[PDB]
């Protein structure tokens, strides 16, 4: 399956460590795992998109 | 150093897989790594808080 697009307001860049980081520009919030839109999906039970799964 | 608080609008819960997930309630956006407020820090050069570093 293709990489899911980022949700609105987010951008992917690369940190000097060589790892990608994801910035929500307006809130200045960063995460080191690709964020995605859950929508009406179940937070506890949904299957995450492959591009967003962390190690494990 | 203590765990950094989540930014506004975010909540940590646990996915059925046993891993934590972080939900921004209003946008329905999820990430699997703890988000944090970067503020005036440099996106490329800042040192991330320990609780937000992914595997590696």
Numbering used by the authors:
A (entry chain A), B (entry chain A): 300 to 355
Direct quotes from the study:
Human DGCR8 is composed of an N-terminal region that is required for nuclear localization, a central heme-binding domain (HBD, residues 276–498), two double-stranded RNA-binding domains (dsRBDs, residues 500–700) and a C-terminal tail (CTT, residues 701–751). The HBD is a dimer and each HBD dimer binds one heme molecule. The HBD coordinates the heme Fe(III) using two thiol/thiolate groups from the highly-conserved Cys352 residues contributed by both subunits. The dimerization domain is an integral part of the heme-binding domain in human DGCR8; it aligns residues important for heme-binding in proper spatial positions.
